[PDB]
Structure formats: C-alpha cells, structure tokens
RNA sequence: UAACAGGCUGAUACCGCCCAAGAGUUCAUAUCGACGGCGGUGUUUGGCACCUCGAUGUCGGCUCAUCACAUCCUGGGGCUGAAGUAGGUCCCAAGGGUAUGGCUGUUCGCCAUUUAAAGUGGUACGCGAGCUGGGUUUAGAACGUCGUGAGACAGUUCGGUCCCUAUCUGCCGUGGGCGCUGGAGAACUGAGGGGGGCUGCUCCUAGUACGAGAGGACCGGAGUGGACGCAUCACUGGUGUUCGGGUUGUCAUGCCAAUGGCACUGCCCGGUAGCUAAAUGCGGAAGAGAUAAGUGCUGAAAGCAUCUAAGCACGAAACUUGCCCCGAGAUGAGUUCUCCCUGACCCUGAUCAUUUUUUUGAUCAAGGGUCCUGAAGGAACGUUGAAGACGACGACGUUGAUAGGCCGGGUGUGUAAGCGCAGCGAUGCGUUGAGCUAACCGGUACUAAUGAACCGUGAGGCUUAACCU
RNA sequence: GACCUGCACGAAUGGCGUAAUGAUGGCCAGGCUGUCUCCACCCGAGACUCAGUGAAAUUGAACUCGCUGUGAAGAUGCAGUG
RNA sequence: GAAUACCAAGGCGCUUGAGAGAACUCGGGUGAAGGAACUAGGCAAAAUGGUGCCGUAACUUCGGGAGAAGGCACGCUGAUAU
RNA sequence: GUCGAGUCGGCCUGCGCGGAAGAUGUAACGGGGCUAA
RNA sequence: CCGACUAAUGUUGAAAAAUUAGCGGAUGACUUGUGGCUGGGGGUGAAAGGCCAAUCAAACCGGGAGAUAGCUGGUUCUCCC
RNA sequence: GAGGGGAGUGAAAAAGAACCUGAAACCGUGUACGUACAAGCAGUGGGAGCACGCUUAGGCGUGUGACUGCGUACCUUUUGUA
C-alpha cells in the first residue's frame, strides 16, 4: 500500500504538529550545595537534598 | 477484607474433624425424596482437599456398583450433616488424581499409624 | 425511588437452611448524605444530590468544600444523582442509610466494568477464528472480510472491530436482594455485579420489578 | 491484560532473570553502591532484602538456603556476618534508590541502590 | 475485437394481473383454472460490444457482513369445500430469528438426523492489498480418442511458487489543539445517536369448548429450557516457565552431606493471585401512544342501504416511547452549586469640566510596555493502580499506607536442614504436618514518594429592556 | 466386490496376474490429539514508548466526506442534498 | 556410536540499546468434556519410539512378509561372590 | 295499497382513482415547499 | 556425506531458492578434491527441451547495424485568412 | 577535535581552498494578512476587513483575502474522456 498522490509540504507540517519537545518545567536546587539538578534525582556533584550521598 | 470474613466466620462448622488425602472418610449426606428428608452415606478415600475457608471443599472417590464415582463436598454446606474418618490412610501427595488410574490391588492406600 | 451508592466490597455464598448456596455480592452502602437537592422553578427537573464515604481534607479543593459546606455535611469522596419520583421528597443534609432497601426485593445495580484494554475482535465481539492449520497464512485471530465490493466502498459505521473493551459503565438488572444488614451497612445481592473489588457501585431499586 | 501481577520481564526469559539478579544482589552486597538502571534497581530491592532478613537468623539451614541463592560464600559470609547484625533492629528498607539521570550509550534512566547504612 | 464483472435491452426467465371453458356432488371464482389477453422485476438463458487488454484476479470453502421483501418461523387479519385438532388461500407485517452431518472441488443435489423455522433475492454471481487454493486455466506424465506427425480434446488421470511495511477515503478505538467571551472545581439537563427486541417444551384453565367417536382447543396463567447477549470469579474447573515437591543424565560449589547450572520449564506431579468457560448471576418484557391489514359505531350524499363524506371506537414482534449505553464541537457550544482575583501606572486616546478653532484639570478604556502582584486551580515531578499500546483515567506524596520491604495470617506443596535412633545397606523412624511459600488478607513509616520552582492573574466588551437609586 | 450395455480395452507404441519394494494415487479402522465443537491461559521474539542510526515501492496537482442521481455507461472532485 | 546430553583444552555472548507487558503476527508450553464432528485431504499437531525375552496371520518368487501384530521385565541396595 | 319531486341506466367526452413489489439513504418535482407555486 | 517428499516462516528476504521441524539414500548405477576433454544448429542429456558461468525451443561478446517496424508513443516560439 | 568568531592579506574572503558567476526544484528563519461550523481541479468575477506606504490630503499603490456567482487539471487517443 502506498500513496496515489504526493502528500504536500503542508500536510507534512500538520502532521509534525505534535512532535514540538517540550522543556523541562522547573530544575530544582540542593539546599546545601545550591547547585541545579532534575528534581528526584541527585546533583552532578552527588548531592540529594542537603545530603552529600556519592563523593568523588 | 475483614467484613466478608465476619460474613462467612457466622457460617462456618465448628465441629469439623480432621482428615487428611488418603484417609477413608464416610460422608453423610440430606436426600429429600418428597416430604421426606433422610441421610445417605457416601464412603470413600479422601484424593483432594481445598482449603479455603468457608468456602473449603474435598472430593471422595469410590467404586460404586461397578462404577467410579467422585464427589466434591463443600465442606460447610447443611447438604453434608457428618463426617467420619473411618481409616487413615497414608500418602506423600496433597493430591490423589493418580488412584483414577488405578484399581483393585493397585489402588490399595496404606494405613497411618498413628 | 431513589437509590443508593456503595462500593463492592467481594463475593462470597450464603448458605440456605435446604442447602442451597446463593452467591452474593456484598456492597457496603454507608450513610448516604444529600448535598444538593434540585427542584423544578431552580434546576428544571427534581433530584437529589448525595455524598458518601469520607476524602481527605487536602484532597477537597475550596470549591468542592464550599459546596460541601453550604449543605452542612462532611466531603465524601465523590457525588451522584438520584432522581425523584413524585411522592419523594428529601432536604439538604439528610442522611439516607441501607435501610431504605429493607422491602425491596430486587434492585439493579452500576458499576464500571474492568477494564480489558486494547481487545480484539475475537475476545471483543466473539468472532470465530480461522483455521489453525490447513495453510492458514497469518489470519488466525484476525477479522476477517469487514464489508462488500465498489457497492458501497465504504466500511459502515458501526462495524464490529479491535478496540478498547471494558473500563465503562455497566447496569445488571433485577438482583435478588438478599440480605440488608443496617447494624453493617451492607446490602447483599444476589449474583455478579460490575466492577473490581473495592469500586463504587450504584444501587437502585429494580426498574422492571 | 497483568491485573494484580507483579514482577518486571525485562525483556529477558526467567532463567536470565534469575541469573542476573543473583549477580547483582552479589555486587550490592560486596560494594553496597551500584549503579543500575531504575526498574533493575527497583527489582533488585525484593531479591537483596529478603536475603538481609534471612541472614539475620544466623543458622546452618539459613546460611544453606542463602548459598542455594547468591551461590557465593563471600556473599553469604558478609550477609550473616555483617550485613544481619548492622540491620538486626531495622525491620525492612535495608536498600535506599537514588535516581542519577540518563546512560549515555541509551538514555536508560539510571539509579544508585545503595545499603542505608553505608 | 472475444472470455470475467459493469452498462443498454428484456426476446427468454421469474413474479403479478384480466377474461372465464371447465374441474370442484351441486356450484367458474374454497382450491384449481383451458384457449387467449395485459403488465412488473432485472432475476435466469440470452442479444449488443459502450467501459477496462501501458492487467478491473473470475469457481467453491472460510471470516465478516449489509440491504430488499415477492415472508421460512414467530405476530395481526379476511375467506374456506374453516366442527375441533390440523390445513388451504389471500392480505398486513422486515422486530428478531432462520441445522449439524455422510458423499462430492463443488454451488447445487441426494441422503441421515435435527429445528419454531432451516426464507427468496441484491451487494464486481458481496468479501483473495482478509485467509484458502480442492476446481477452472502454463510448463511434467499417462489413458481413451483424433491425427501420417508435430500435437489435440468444458474427455479423464497423477503432480504442480497466491507478493504488498496503508498516503488518502472509510471504519474501530484513543489523545492533542482551540473554541464555547474573567478564570476555576464539580454535578447535571438531554437535542441527537447506538444497543436490545428470537423462541421451544411442560403443567393449569381442561379431558373443558368442539365432536358420533378418534381425537381435542381459543382466550388467560405458571414453570422450565435452546440459541444469543452483558457482567463476574463466590462455587466447579483450565492456565498458572514468578510457589512447593519427585526424578534422569552431567558439570560445579575441595570432599561427605547439602545445593546450584544445563538438558523444551530437562522430564514430570501438584498449585497462589490474575486472566478465564465448560462455571453462575442477569437480560429480551410488561405498559403507553399512533397505526397496518382487518373490524366496527353513528351517518347522510342516494327517503333505503352504507365503517366515511362530517363525527366517534378498536386493531400487530413493524413505527414513537418504555429498558441499557454514549451524548452540549447540541458552534443552537445549554443548566445548577461552589471557589478565586478589588495594584503604580506610563504612552495614547475617549469623553467631559477650562479655553480663545486652538487650549487647563478629572475620569475612564476590548489599545500598548514596564513595575508590583501570581489567587482559585492546573500542570509538572515522584510512589503508583484489577486504568492503560502511548497519551488518557484513578490513588497517593511525610498533616503519608502510594509502592517496595517488614510483621502477623492465609494459601500451596507435603513431614526441610541438622542431629539422633533402627538397619550390612538402599532406606525407614523421631525431632515434624516440618521446612519453604509469587501476584492474596490484616497491619506496619524501615526505604522511596523534597522545601521549592512552573503555568494560570489583578473584578471581566457594546446596545437595549426590567428594576435599585 | 460384482454385472457387461467396452460412447471409445486387448495382447512386446505388449495382455492378464504377481511376492517384495515406493517421501507414489485412492479408501477404511485402532491409537492419538486445540484439526474441530470453541476457544482459555501462559513462556519467549516482534508489534507499542524513549535514545541513536535510518530505507522503499509510489507520486499531474489537491483545500483528498456520505447518499441518490448524472456522466466515456461502477464519482472525494458533476447536480441535488445530508 | 564421530548420535545425543553435560563438560575439558580452547574459543565465544553473534556491533544498536533501554523500557512496557495492548490488539495482531511469529516460535513454543498446557488445557475441562468431547475426539476428525475440522478439511479437498488428519494439512498441521498429538502419538509410537530402547534392550532382552515370549509371541507373531494371510500371502510368497520360499529370501521374505516381520521390528508383523501383541505382551512381560527394566531404578537402587544387599547376598549368592568381602 | 301506502310518501310528494323527481327517478332510472345506456352513450360521448375533461380531470382524477385502483391495477403499482427491490435491493447503502428520503431518492420517480433538482431541493424547500405548493391546493396553486 | 549426498539429496530435497511435507509444512510453517520468509516473499522491498538473513538468502536473486534459504531457515526451522520433520523426510530419502547412506559399500554404491555411491560420494568428493585436483587436473583434463567435448562449443552453439554445436556440445552434453538414466530424456525434464534438461544443462552448457544467477542467460537456453538455439549461450555470450563484437560486427552487418541506424536490420525492418503498413504498429505504439512523441514532435518544442507567435499572429492573420 | 570538527566547526566557528575575531585579527590579518587582498580590489573583493557574501574570492577561504566544500573557493568566478551562483538559476530552479527542494528546505528553513523573520514580518504582514488570512485560517480551528468548514465540504470538491484550489482559480476566476465580485468583495469587506487589516497592515504598510504615497508630492494635492485626498483617495490611491502593495500585500492579504472573510463572504459570494461561476467553475471536474494537462497531453494522448478517440464516435465520445472529470
Ligand atoms: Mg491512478
Ligand atoms: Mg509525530
Ligand atoms: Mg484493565
Ligand atoms: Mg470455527
Ligand atoms: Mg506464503
Ligand atoms: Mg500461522
Ligand atoms: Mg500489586
Ligand atoms: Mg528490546
Ligand atoms: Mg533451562
Ligand atoms: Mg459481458
Ligand atoms: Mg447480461
Ligand atoms: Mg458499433
Ligand atoms: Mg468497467
Ligand atoms: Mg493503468
Ligand atoms: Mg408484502
Ligand atoms: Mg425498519
Ligand atoms: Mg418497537
Ligand atoms: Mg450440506
Ligand atoms: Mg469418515
Ligand atoms: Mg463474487
Ligand atoms: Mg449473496
Ligand atoms: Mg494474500
Ligand atoms: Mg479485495
Ligand atoms: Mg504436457
Ligand atoms: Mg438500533
Ligand atoms: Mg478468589
Ligand atoms: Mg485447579
Ligand atoms: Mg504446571
Ligand atoms: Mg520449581
Ligand atoms: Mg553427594
Ligand atoms: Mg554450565
Ligand atoms: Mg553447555
Ligand atoms: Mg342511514
Ligand atoms: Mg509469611
Ligand atoms: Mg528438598
Ligand atoms: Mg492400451
Ligand atoms: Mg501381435
Ligand atoms: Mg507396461
Ligand atoms: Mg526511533
Ligand atoms: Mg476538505
Ligand atoms: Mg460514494
Ligand atoms: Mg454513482
Ligand atoms: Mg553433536
Ligand atoms: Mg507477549
Ligand atoms: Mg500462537
Ligand atoms: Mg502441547
Ligand atoms: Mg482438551
Ligand atoms: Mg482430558
Ligand atoms: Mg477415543
Ligand atoms: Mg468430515
Ligand atoms: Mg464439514
Ligand atoms: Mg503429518
Ligand atoms: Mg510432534
Ligand atoms: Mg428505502
Ligand atoms: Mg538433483
Ligand atoms: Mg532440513
Ligand atoms: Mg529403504
Ligand atoms: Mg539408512
Ligand atoms: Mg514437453
Ligand atoms: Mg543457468
Ligand atoms: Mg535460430
Ligand atoms: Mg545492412
Ligand atoms: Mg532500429
Ligand atoms: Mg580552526
Ligand atoms: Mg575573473
Ligand atoms: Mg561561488
Ligand atoms: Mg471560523
Ligand atoms: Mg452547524
Ligand atoms: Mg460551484
Ligand atoms: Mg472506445
Ligand atoms: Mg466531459
């Protein structure tokens, strides 16, 4: 099964309509270590809220 | 959940012996022939037992005027007035589906010494 | 009549003096209180509003605690409609209980029917299959033909095919009503109802009768 | 339809499953830190902490029972010796789950599951 | 320019009607209808060659249907050569229903045995980008037959590759956007749409009515079934590679003992939750309205007669409701309850109060941008669910039982390990219904559900009318 | 298995038999079964979601609905209408 | 047994992964009652399956047919026999 | 024999009536509607 | 080891003929390595018009060659009669 | 690193070696207008509104195009083709 007609440029940005990524809403910042991090999860620098949980 | 328990605890038998798969047990069961109302007695090994509450169970088989015959009595119904271990038997299994393939000699269950 | 909300508690038997075993669904209908009552000159038909069941206060947003206020009654956890029959009147903050089931003898009951997902044709509309075997490529379970030729070139409307199957409201008429146990609150019916354990079920009295 | 079930598949067969998680509860035992993706981490929690409960009744037929899973008498060693004493007064939650963002090689969220007490 | 299907046609076919010889004891018209006549359908056999030969796959089966009514059953009715029972024939009626097998590629047909009945047609003789491929219709081979022969035969015989990841329409489901005129959380109304609609047998009425008897009802009531449908898992069961056990071969954990891996879950026996049918609850209706054929009342035209013209009453599974489900994108965007927001402004305009057509202050806006503000609620994130492809929907986030774990229980398996005793030993016995026990029940903050942050605003157009001042 | 009415068998383009043999054609029975009545559950690989890579046939142009009719005679595109 | 199962020496996990646990497809496991009713046709599936011994019909070219068919035994320990 | 104004059944003709059943959907005025439109 | 009877899959394949479960021969008219010979109206064929380099009722390459094509397609700016 | 921004050379680097000119298909970013009750060759005739701009201050120019009449591509071949 394949198409009779070229679908149109414009049928394809339609249909791309609903693929816009959406951004995160909110990074969350560690009490101690005030650094940003995705809210749940542990800091680059291996802080969990307040808590120095991974070191090096 | 704890109100269906109370709702079938009220049910339940309090006089229940025990038996175990194996044991030749005789049942005792209300035949309402018209008006009338009596006890029949249905007497053979014990190959299954379901516990389960109220809602427990357990089939007997017999040989029955040349035929086998199995029955699964709820345990708690008013259909059965009694039950009466009549001899312990003694096996490994919790089920005895294997005895339907056996008869006679090679259907013997040997007796719980105990 | 005005019906009742509960929630299905499970399934279990009774068991007769004659030895017979009902099966019977337990519904445990608390305290029914009335929120809202709806007259004819405000609303344009005749009702009541109830509530049942409690919600935790940070669950009740300030509209729903308004509403709930205004009528003097304690959140529960969801509102239903009951229409009123002409001889049937209630007031705002009237408590309704289990009782109001002691004479009647059968009742029919809604609730949302478990969900099946995503359901193909033969679980959902009970189409045959195909061959196993016989040299049966790929066609199993599958529908089949769904219509005609270039007369009419179109699939009709309505067409039994795959879909979402369950997860939606269902009535079971006319139960036996077995049991009404106030001191409880439970209402014992006779037979399956709708819905898992646990979930809110709508009990009127039977409609056929 | 999976009413009620539980237990991830992971796209694995039962046998590899098994394999796998006696491994891993292994790793988190020796290291009591390991990095694995989240629902692995969330799996490994009901294999690692019935093993804790079980080694903290130090008996022959338990430590038999904790060989025949593990299969590691290091591992089991460091259960009954160490890991049942330090968790002797904790009934249950022996594990804590850390959610570290994303693999690089396949955008598998990621965790730490690490012993509480480490 | 043929074979398929469409198209045109309708001789032929099928169906209906007109006339009425005659059959029917009598009696054309209960039923049938000679010789002839008139139509309907598109429906068979055909006619034609208009479409397609830069391809519109053609029998039968399977799956899935959908419509017509010329009705097979069930429903209503007139006539009967209708006593009853059961029939005949015609009229109304399309709601629902409407065999399984043996033979054969069959469709068909015949046969067996069912059923209330086993309807007749249209839909590319419905349906191969849904299945099949037995038949037709390639290449092999053979028979009969024809031919000197190559070969040939809607004669037969054995064998003989069925592709496509769906763009559009359509259809089943499910979200996202905006709208609905301040924003928000809920409960609704019901325009409209869909589902459903089948029926047997037994008993009573009653061995009554009818009938010489044999037989044997209407009307009404009761129960219990077949098929179908919806829900559910209490029961009976299946499954149950996540629970327990038995066992073969082998390899390992040093070895014994005890265990683990592999062999289809190695092979098996059981089996929890869930899912589920064969399991068990429930349904089709009653009632109402308007009617069909049909039956009437009163009643003239037409002094009679007449169901009809005026008027009035009955009358069926069809129609409209009643029952179940969807349903305000019903843009005609509806209703009810509740909740929230009561800043400085500038730019500039609009009006006014001041002027000297220009001007000097006040009030207010469906302009605009900044400042302060950020509510109700929402979303997000996290723990999740008998909810789920993903979205969605539901529960919960420390003021907490949402999940995991943990504790107690239940369930299942069936008396662990270790030790002891008996036995030469395999093994048996005791400790012991032991040990282990998933998805179950009751509990429990041990672990993970973080303070925040984000979105959403700041009283909501014009006119007219009814009022309050 | 017979009958003979051989449309149109027949004797080395052999006739009639024939033990054994055949992934050969036909028919019947026991066993066996999810072939089926009539499907249910389960274990795996896809299908579905996320990240990385990244095809194809086809394609006059498309703002690419239903119905009844019309019409190169079987219409998303004509008429009317929903 | 150079079959097969598990291993040694040795060599490998096959150059996308991560989740989820719908329909449907593929490859498999099990199934109440029935048991070829399926279908062109038992297609597919299920089943049989080893060794020793007992026993084995018509027919026959005297070799066969025949593994016809059908049936019994089978593990482990001890003794006979350290 | 009874009532007091017409009665009867042939012909020709204008307009209508029955005869008149089909398949996706009203679907045999293009539609709405029309007793004249 | 040599085959290829049945089915399912696959059919823009993992593969221009395979994979999987089954299947036949398996001391012989067997099977295999290396090399050799037969050449296109010619070879070779336990015979299917089979095979002769994914090509066979007359191989492939080059040439006659722009064969011929009463057939199909296509044939390019403008205006006036 | 790739790649880029400067600096510098040069008449020119928008001649930087992926290098003279640098068309079209095709793909983007920005601005104006239209577009979420609306049915079909997408234009044509009519036509409001909006935005920008114009030497007479007046309408006009450019872009868009609500709503509305009409309207089934092109070639080829044909008796005749949406
Ligand atoms: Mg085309
Ligand atoms: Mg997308
Ligand atoms: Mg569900
Ligand atoms: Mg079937
Ligand atoms: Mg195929
Ligand atoms: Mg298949
Ligand atoms: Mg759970
Ligand atoms: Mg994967
Ligand atoms: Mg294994
Ligand atoms: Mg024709
Ligand atoms: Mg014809
Ligand atoms: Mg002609
Ligand atoms: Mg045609
Ligand atoms: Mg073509
Ligand atoms: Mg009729
Ligand atoms: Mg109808
Ligand atoms: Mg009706
Ligand atoms: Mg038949
Ligand atoms: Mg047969
Ligand atoms: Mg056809
Ligand atoms: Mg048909
Ligand atoms: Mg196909
Ligand atoms: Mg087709
Ligand atoms: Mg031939
Ligand atoms: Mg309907
Ligand atoms: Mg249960
Ligand atoms: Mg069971
Ligand atoms: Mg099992
Ligand atoms: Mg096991
Ligand atoms: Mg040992
Ligand atoms: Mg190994
Ligand atoms: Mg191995
Ligand atoms: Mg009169
Ligand atoms: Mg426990
Ligand atoms: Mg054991
Ligand atoms: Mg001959
Ligand atoms: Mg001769
Ligand atoms: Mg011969
Ligand atoms: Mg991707
Ligand atoms: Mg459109
Ligand atoms: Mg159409
Ligand atoms: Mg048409
Ligand atoms: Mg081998
Ligand atoms: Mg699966
Ligand atoms: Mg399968
Ligand atoms: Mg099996
Ligand atoms: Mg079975
Ligand atoms: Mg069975
Ligand atoms: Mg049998
Ligand atoms: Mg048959
Ligand atoms: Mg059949
Ligand atoms: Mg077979
Ligand atoms: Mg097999
Ligand atoms: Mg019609
Ligand atoms: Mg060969
Ligand atoms: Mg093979
Ligand atoms: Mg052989
Ligand atoms: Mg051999
Ligand atoms: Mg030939
Ligand atoms: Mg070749
Ligand atoms: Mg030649
Ligand atoms: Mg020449
Ligand atoms: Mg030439
Ligand atoms: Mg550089
Ligand atoms: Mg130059
Ligand atoms: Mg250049
Ligand atoms: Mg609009
Ligand atoms: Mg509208
Ligand atoms: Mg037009
Ligand atoms: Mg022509
Ligand atoms: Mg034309």
């Known amino acids: 099964a394949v198409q009779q007609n070229k679908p149109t440029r414009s049928k394809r940005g339609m249909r791309r309509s609903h693929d816009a990524l959406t951004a995160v809403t909110s990074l969350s910042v560690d009490k101690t270590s005030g650094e940003k991090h995705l809210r749940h999860h542990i800091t680059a620098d291996g802080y969990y809220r307040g808590r120095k949980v991974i070191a090096k | ?114 | 009549m005005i019906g009742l909300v509960g929630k299905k508690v499970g399934m279990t038997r009774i068991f007769t003096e004659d030895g017979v075993s009902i099966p019977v669904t337990v519904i445990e209908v608390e305290a029914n209180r009335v929120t809202q009552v709806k007259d004819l000159a405000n609303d344009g038909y005749r009702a009541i509003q109830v509530t049942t069941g409690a919600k935790k206060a940070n669950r009740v947003t300030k509209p729903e605690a308004g509403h709930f206020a205004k009528a003097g009654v304690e959140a529960g956890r969801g509102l239903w409609e009951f229409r009123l029959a002409e001889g049937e009147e209630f007031t705002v903050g009237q408590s309704i209980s289990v009782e109001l089931f002691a004479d009647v003898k059968k009742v029919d009951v809604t609730g949302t029917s478990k969900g099946k997902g995503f359901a193909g044709t033969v679980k959902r509309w009970n189409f045959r299959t195909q061959d196993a075997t016989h040299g049966n490529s790929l066609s199993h379970r599958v529908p089949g033909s769904i219509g005609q030729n270039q007369t009419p070139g179109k699939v009709f409307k309505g067409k039994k095919m795959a879909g979402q199957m369950g997860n939606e409201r269902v009535t079971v008429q006319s139960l036996d009503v077995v049991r009404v146990d106030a001191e409880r609150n439970l209402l014992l019916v006779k037979g399956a109802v709708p819905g898992a354990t646990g979930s809110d079920l709508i009990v009127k009295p039977a409609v056929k009768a | 339809m999976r009413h009620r079930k539980s237990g991830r598949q992971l796209n694995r067969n039962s046998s590899h499953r098994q394999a796998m998680f006696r491994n891993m509860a292994g790793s988190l035992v020796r290291h009591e830190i390991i990095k694995t993706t989240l629902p692995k981490a969330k799996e490994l929690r009901r294999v690692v902490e019935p093993l804790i409960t079980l080694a903290k009744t130090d008996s022959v037929a338990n430590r038999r029972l904790a060989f025949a899973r593990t299969r590691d008498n290091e591992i089991v060693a460091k259960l009954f010796n160490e890991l049942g004493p330090r968790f002797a007064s904790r009934a249950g939650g022996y594990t804590r789950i850390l959610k570290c963002g994303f693999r690089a090689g396949d955008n598998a969220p990621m965790a730490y599951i690490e012993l509480v007490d480490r």
């Open chain 2, 1 to 114: 959940s704890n109100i269906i328990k109370q709702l079938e605890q009220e049910q339940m038998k309090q006089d229940v012996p025990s038996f175990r798969p194996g044991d030749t047990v005789e049942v005792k069961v209300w035949v309402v022939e018209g008006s009338k109302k009596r006890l029949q007695a249905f007497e053979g090994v014990v190959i299954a037992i379901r516990n389960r509450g109220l809602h427990s169970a357990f089939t007997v088989r017999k040989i029955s005027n040349g035929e086998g015959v199995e029955r699964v009595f709820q345990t708690h119904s008013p259909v059965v007035d009694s039950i009466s271990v009549k001899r312990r038997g003694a096996v490994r299994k919790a089920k005895l589906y294997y005895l339907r393939e056996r008869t006679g000699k090679a259907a013997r269950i040997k007796e719980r010494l105990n």
